Structures are given as C-alpha cells and as structure tokens.
C-alpha cells in the first residue's frame, strides 16, 4: 500500500533528522570517551555493574537501521550513555565529569530537537 510508503517517507526524515541531532551531541564529546562501547576485554566485570551499556556507535548502527521509532527512544539511549558513566565512575574522575558536561550541553540540542519533531510531525 501507498499508506506504508507515506509512513516510510516520514521514518526516513526522522532518521535524517536524528542523524543531525546525533552528530551535534557527539560533537560535545571531543575526547571521544562515549564514542565506542566500554571494552569487556578491558573491563571484564562491566556487565555486573551496568545492565544496559550504551555508546554513540551503537546508537549510530541502530539509527542507520531506522530502528528509532521516535525521539523518546533516541533520548532514552542518550541518557543511558550518561547515567551508566555516572554510576560506574566516581565523581572525581575525568569520565564522570565528561558525562556531566555532555548532559548539560546535550540539553540545548534536545530542547530544540523536541520542537523540530513536533513542528514537522
Ligand atoms: Na558510582
């Protein structure tokens, strides 16, 4: 049906919008601390600490697989990146501090992306 082609032409724009948003968020981590998944070879016990790992490349693979149905799912993943880091790492570390900074600077990008999703449907 054509009614599925109109749905696919919207998901394809959402996927096109979410790509810009992901790029803007990832520019707030110039140290690339959140670029890749935490290595299980380097942190063997990680999954004892954190049940749902998340990172930017993992979000990206999903994204290009049109796996985000909406902005709320995309946000959830972003928030995991931040909250996982803030549990696993102590307050006086470079990792925890990078998340605090990513959260603070990522808010401005997400406050406007909310309006652009609602605005353009
Ligand atoms: Na902690």
């Amino acid at each position: 049906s054509m009614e599925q082609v109109a749905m696919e032409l919207r998901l394809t724009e959402l996927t096109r919008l979410l790509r810009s948003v992901l790029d803007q968020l990832q520019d707030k981590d110039p140290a690339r601390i959140f670029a890749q998944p935490v290595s299980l070879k380097e942190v063997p016990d990680y999954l004892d600490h954190i049940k749902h790992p998340m990172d930017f490349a993992t979000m990206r693979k999903r994204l290009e697989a049109q796996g985000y149905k909406n902005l709320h799912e995309f946000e959830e993943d972003f928030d995991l990146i931040i909250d996982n880091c803030m549990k696993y790492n102590a307050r006086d570390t470079v990792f925890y501090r990078a998340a605090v900074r990513l959260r603070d600077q990522g808010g401005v990008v997400l406050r406007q992306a909310r309006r652009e999703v609602d605005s353009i449907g």
Side-chain angles (χ1 to χ4, degrees), residues 1-2 4-6 8 11-15 17-40 42-60 62-68 70-110 112-119:
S1 65
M2 190 87 201
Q4 303 296 319
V5 165
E8 290 148 29
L11 183 52
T12 298
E13 291 295 335
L14 176 64
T15 303
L17 187 135
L18 287 183
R19 206 179 289 130
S20 161
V21 177
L22 189 46
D23 294 333
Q24 292 178 63
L25 296 175
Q26 184 149 29
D27 291 334
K28 305 313 176 163
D29 171 40
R32 294 190 73 81
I33 288 164
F34 309 103
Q36 291 303 324
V38 173
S39 183
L40 308 184
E42 295 166 13
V43 191
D45 71 3
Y46 191 60
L47 303 192
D48 306 349
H49 292 271
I50 292 297
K51 298 305 184 183
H52 302 93
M54 195 40 58
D55 72 274
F56 285 129
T58 300
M59 287 184 73
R60 199 167 292 286
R62 176 162 171 172
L63 186 61
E64 292 306 304
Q66 308 191 332
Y68 289 120
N70 58 54
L71 176 66
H72 183 79
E73 296 187 338
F74 180 85
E75 281 187 308
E76 276 187 344
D77 274 346
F78 179 60
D79 288 337
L80 273 180
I81 296 178
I82 295 299
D83 298 327
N84 291 344
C85 181
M86 297 179 71
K87 292 161 189 83
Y88 187 80
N89 300 101
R91 204 149 43 245
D92 69 337
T93 69
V94 68
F95 309 106
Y96 182 106
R97 294 164 176 277
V100 164
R101 292 168 59 82
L102 179 56
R103 181 187 71 180
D104 290 9
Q105 308 194 316
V108 187
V109 177
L110 293 172
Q112 200 67 36
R114 169 47 64 193
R115 301 188 65 102
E116 288 168 321
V117 158
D118 292 345
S119 173

